[PDB]
Write a protein that binds this DNA or RNA. Structure first.
Lengths: 99, 60
RNA sequence: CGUACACGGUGGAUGCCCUGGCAGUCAAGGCGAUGAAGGACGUGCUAAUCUGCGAUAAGCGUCGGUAAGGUGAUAUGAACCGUUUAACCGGCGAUUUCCGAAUGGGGAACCCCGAUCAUUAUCCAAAUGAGGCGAACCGGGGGAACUGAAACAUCUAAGUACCCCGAGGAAAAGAAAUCAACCGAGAUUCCCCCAGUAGCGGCGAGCGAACGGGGAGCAGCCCGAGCCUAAUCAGUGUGUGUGUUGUGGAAGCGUCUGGAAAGGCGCGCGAUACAGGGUGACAGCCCCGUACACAAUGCACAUGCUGUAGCUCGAUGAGUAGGGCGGGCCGUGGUACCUGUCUGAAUAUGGGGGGACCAUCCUCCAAGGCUAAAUACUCUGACUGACCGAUAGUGAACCAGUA
RNA sequence: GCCUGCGAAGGUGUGCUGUGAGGCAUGCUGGAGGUAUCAGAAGUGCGAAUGCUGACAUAAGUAACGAUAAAGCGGGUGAAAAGCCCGCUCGCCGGAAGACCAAGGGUUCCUGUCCAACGUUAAUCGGGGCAGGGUGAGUCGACCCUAAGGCGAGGCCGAAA
């Protein structure tokens, strides 16, 4: 699954190629990564979608479908950041099949 | 203060503490009078303290 | 103003979904005067509800598990805690104001004390019991009517509804003065059958066994003395088979549509694990979970063991058997059982019974007592269901037994 | 044994076929699944119980507001004022619409800010909505006791609340 203590790599959105850590995950499936932000009116570095209106959620609203964590396949993506105190998870992290 | 600390203290130490915390349990009461330095942390913590020591006192 | 349609509205059906019900199944099963169940009223920085607690008030402590996220449902603002490893999960311990079955007395929660009955009694309540609650089941008593008989006084519904008293997790029954196809069976209940037969009945309508057989479960023993010690009693040690949580746990693949697939299409896989749910639209191979594994508790039913402790001899219970009068009840017939009044035996060189009475066979012996085991319900936990789907289904999937 | 987001079921309109009960197709929409064959199935196919429940039309924009029958003329404020406020004038009530209280109701009292909801019109008004404030006694009342009467305990009656 996806965690907040992990780094993601865009692959489709206009932010394709950008790197960053996962800010937070909502029960909606969307994930906001430290980097994919938008320029508000008074030019305030705050993530948000591009649409006119009053008060709307923050976050650029990224999708786990176009992201890139640890995909077991041939892609253009590269290294990705990932607990350790678990021990058993370290074994999976050591394996080139899981994490 | 944690239960571990109170248990280590002597019977008199728990009394002087309960009393010290009792005297302590006075200073606060000033918000309604218009205070600021009054902290909400110990507001609820102090009542537990004077109680924790009160529980161990009986455990002895 | 007639009629059809178009656009918009009203309205809410329908289609789909559903954190709910309904039903079945397995497991498990009492609480309290060490004052419970229930209720009242507090308690989170703000919180009006619900839930959790209860004035150390949705919390405190210990151990174990677990884990970095956490501070109940509401994802708010403020803000706190956590590595001196919290939250959360399981068990246990400490504390637990006042009122409250509380019983000192009164009382619509407020004020002062062991009230009442009863046993023992150092008669001092001094030492104890009862006085409450709980889904149904169970035992011992009291006991209808409408209705049916297409009227109705027997009968039938009833020995039911309801009422009184009481135990347990189980009760009641029970070791035979029985049964009676027999040179035989042989403690008692329960299930099936035997019978809808025998029997009862304005013999009208209706009512209605048992012996035996096939099964489930099997255990037999105690009341005067003699004697001596392994029944019994008292006490001690103290289980195998477990309860919840966490650990050993594979897995986005390709193309197309789309904001997104749990789509279409193509391919592969799990299976002593072919329930279901979650994840942005129908993913058993995404996540949990299903078979599985391990550790924390409760129960630990039993067994072992100490001191007691065998065994032996004789007898065996009268206002009873039985008879008469008046009733209840039963399938009970002059041949069921029981209550009330009166009368009243013998005694094992005796007596009772085998569905009639009295003399002659067979069987068995009352008028004293105890006794394990074999099914019930369903609050609670879990699972399932070709059940229903929110004018359906429990009245309640939304504050509901609330408005 | 097939169809489907190069889009289904359902719904609306329409074409075709069957003696029919219906099947089937097209367009729009929907936009998630839905069928045919043979076979079994269901709490199966419905306009006509002064039927049950919810909704709705015509009726009607029709009926009704009446002994304390009093408002009127100017002015103020306001985006609006015939019934908010000021002055004057004109009246009602007097055991009474006056004053003080029981029971009961219960904060409805006062102030400030408003009004979407309430006020059989409107409202810048309110006993309306929201946020605060207010009811500081030994001699007031409760608290205490008692009358008709009632209850609990002992006594006595199949049994007993």
């Amino acid at each position: 699954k996806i965690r907040r203590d992990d780094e993601v790599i865009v692959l489709t959105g206009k932010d394709k190629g950008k790197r960053g850590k996962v800010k937070n995950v909502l029960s909606s499936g969307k994930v906001i990564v430290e980097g994919i932000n938008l320029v508000k009116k008074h030019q305030k570095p705050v993530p948000a979608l591009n649409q006119p209106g009053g008060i709307v959620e923050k976050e650029a609203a990224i999708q786990v479908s176009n992201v890139a964590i640890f995909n077991a396949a041939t892609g253009k993506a590269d290294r990705v950041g990932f607990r350790f105190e678990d021990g058993k998870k370290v074994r999976f992290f050591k394996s080139n099949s899981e994490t | 203060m944690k239960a571990k600390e109170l248990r280590e203290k002597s019977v008199e130490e728990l009394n002087t503490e309960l009393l010290n915390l009792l005297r302590e349990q006075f200073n606060l009461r000033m918000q309604a009078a218009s205070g600021q330095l009054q902290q909400s942390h110990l507001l609820k913590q102090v009542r537990r303290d004077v109680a924790r020591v009160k529980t161990l006192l009986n455990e002895k």
